[PDB]
Write a protein that binds this DNA or RNA. Structure first.
Ligand SMILES: Nc1nc2c(ncn2[C@H]2C[C@H](O)[C@@H](COP(=O)(O)OP(=O)(O)OP(=O)(O)O)O2)c(=O)[nH]1
Ligand SMILES: [Mg+2]
Ligand SMILES: [Mg+2]
Ligand SMILES: [Mg+2]
Length: 539
DNA sequence: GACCACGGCGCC
DNA sequence: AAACGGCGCCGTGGTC
């Protein structure tokens, strides 16, 4: 290309280099742009940011987040990663995308700009006549990228002092548990080392090894296995409790307070838009889509996520989402009628399986039932259903029997989905998002049947993901008008921040936007709550 | 110090 | 072991 002075013209493709991957923490090392046979390099990249009307190019969202951190409204536009990801969701990194579609991902802003221009041209070529993928790009993925940039840059308020205090107390309890483990072992060891634990449990003590590890074939010490040995030694109980405490302490309690950004005062995740095989988002650096919720300590941790003073959190979660999506995709008359009557399958399974009235069904129980409903649907074995439910074998075969043909056309849709996948090489969501599943005609049954369960899950998980993304796209400008913020997405859930005076209005409107995003043959329902913290906002 | 594979486990 | 699906992070044991 011709080297031309900085500033590029309207609509050039950007390239940039960050000191590190996290846009909120990164130094912008270099910036450049490409257009009309010219390349333009910024002499000082922070100043040069102000010249651009949009970030158009590879990883556009990340540059926009960094721009927003600097008080600049620089929205992300076209991004070839999104085109590639829609062509094939195994396109997840610029390294792979570059090499597949006609360049090389280097460490020089100018080359990255030139690469972005030609990859766009090429990937746009590959999408000619792909009307549905084009619809998803223009109506979902491209505008979603601007919403995620705003979410990332806003971050969430964390109660830091509280988490520090909690750490000091959890440490004393951890030392009580490990002292007693060491007393039962007859000696100390590194209890965090699963290899050392293996030796202690199965070689030194008498315990039977009920399982091997996948890749290396060691005797397993997972909670599944240790559940089996709960009565067979007291020590196991102590280990499981230690595991829980150390997991929560090392993953959330200790790292999160150290991630508060000094300028914003807030905690900033990244929402990765080309990371999953199904069209879902992921969250990283720190993952805020797996904050504990389940155990009493998990609940304590979740209370650390709070509203700014004068604001409240609003938490919205889709009811029974993939079950509703299934009703629509399959067209099953019985499953449709179940949601038309306002039934709750999760509560009904809990009630059945624990043998209590619905009124007594607690959150712990509801989660257990989810495992069963989604397990069975997505091809769980009779054997593994027996384990889990803790019941005989032929009963599980009959349960899986009872589950299907209660909903006869689910099976017919599973079969239809697999034959299209075998013939075309890919399966698709309601909106035409594709996933290529190559192993459907594999000759090794295990490899074939795993490919099958991945294949028929994707249209269901992926359609739910499509719906949520579209709701976000529709909701965001409505929130801006009302002076509220979108903070987090957790697959079928949004967490917003609203000024106290507008909180109820905001909750009502977001609920409606989420429920009416794309009408199906069953109603979507959204549970919404409002509170000072994330836990209290879902009660 | 970075990177890796693995087991294990938090959430959806 | 259990072969529901989709993720990312931790502490290991280990290499370079
Ligand atoms: N295959 C599978 N999918 C799951 C599992 N847990 C959650 N999901 C998927 C399916 C759910 O519909 C979706 C949203 O998770 P939620 O915790 O919100 O469950 P759901 O919305 O169905 O129930 P809810 O009515 O919100 O309590 O994520 C699981 O254990 N297996
Ligand atoms: Mg839900
Ligand atoms: Mg949810
Ligand atoms: Mg792994």
């Amino acid at each position: 290309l011709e080297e031309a002075p900085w500033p590029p013209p309207e609509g050039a493709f950007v390239g940039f280099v960050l000191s590190r991957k996290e846009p909120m923490w990164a130094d912008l090392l270099a910036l450049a742009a490409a257009r009309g046979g010219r390349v333009h390099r910024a002499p000082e990249p922070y100043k040069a940011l102000r010249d651009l009307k949009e970030a158009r190019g590879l990883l556009a969202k990340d540059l926009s987040v960094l721009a927003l951190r600097e008080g600049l409204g620089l929205p992300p536009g076209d991004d070839p990663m999104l085109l590639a990801y829609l062509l094939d969701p195994s396109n997840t990194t610029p390294e792979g995308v570059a090499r597949r579609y006609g360049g090389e991902w280097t460490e020089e802003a100018g080359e990255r700009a030139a690469l972005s221009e030609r990859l766009f041209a090429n990937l746009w070529g590959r999408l000619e006549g792909e009307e549905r993928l084009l619809w998803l790009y223009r109506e979902v993925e491209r505008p979603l990228s601007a919403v995620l940039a705003h979410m990332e840059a806003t971050g969430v308020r964390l109660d830091v002092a509280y988490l520090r205090a909690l750490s000091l107390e959890v440490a004393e309890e951890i030392a009580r548990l490990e002292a007693e483990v060491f007393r039962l072992a007859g000696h100390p060891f590194n209890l965090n080392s699963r290899d050392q634990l293996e030796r202690v449990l199965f070689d030194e003590l008498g315990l039977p090894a009920i399982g091997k590890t996948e890749k290396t074939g060691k005797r397993s010490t997972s909670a599944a296995v240790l559940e089996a040995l709960r009565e067979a030694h007291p020590i196991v109980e102590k280990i499981l409790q230690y595991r829980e405490l150390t997991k929560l302490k090392s993953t959330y309690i200790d790292p999160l307070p150290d991630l508060i950004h000094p300028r914003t005062g807030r905690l900033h995740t990244r929402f990765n838009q080309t990371a999953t095989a199904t069209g879902r988002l992921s969250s990283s650096d720190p993952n805020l889509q797996n904050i504990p919720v389940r155990t009493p300590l998990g609940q304590r941790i979740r209370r650390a996520f709070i509203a700014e003073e004068g604001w409240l959190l609003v938490a919205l979660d889709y009811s029974q989402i993939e079950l509703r999506v299934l009703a629509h995709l399959s067209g099953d008359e019985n499953l449709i009628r179940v949601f038309q009557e306002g039934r709750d399958i999760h509560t009904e399974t809990a009630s059945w399986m624990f043998g209590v009235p619905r009124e007594a069904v607690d959150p712990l129980m509801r989660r257990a039932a989810k495992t069963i409903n989604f397990g069975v649907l997505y091809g769980m074995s009779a054997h593994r259903l027996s384990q889990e439910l803790a019941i005989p074998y032929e009963e599980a075969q009959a349960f899986i029997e009872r589950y299907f043909q209660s909903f006869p056309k689910v099976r017919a849709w599973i079969e239809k989905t697999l034959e299209e996948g075998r013939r075309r090489g890919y399966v698709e969501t309601l909106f035409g998002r594709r996933r290529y599943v190559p192993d459907l005609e594999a000759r090794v049954k295990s490899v074939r049947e795993a490919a099958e369960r991945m294949a028929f899950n994707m249209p269901v998980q992926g359609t739910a993901a499509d719906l949520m993304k579209l709701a976000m796209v529709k909701l965001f400008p409505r929130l801006e008008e009302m002076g509220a913020r979108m903070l987090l997405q957790v697959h079928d859930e949004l967490v917003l921040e609203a000024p106290k005076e507008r909180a109820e209005a905001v909750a009502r409107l977001a609920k409606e936007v989420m429920e009416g995003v794309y009408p199906l043959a069953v109603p979507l329902e959204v549970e919404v709550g409002i509170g000072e913290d994330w836990l209290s906002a879902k009660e």
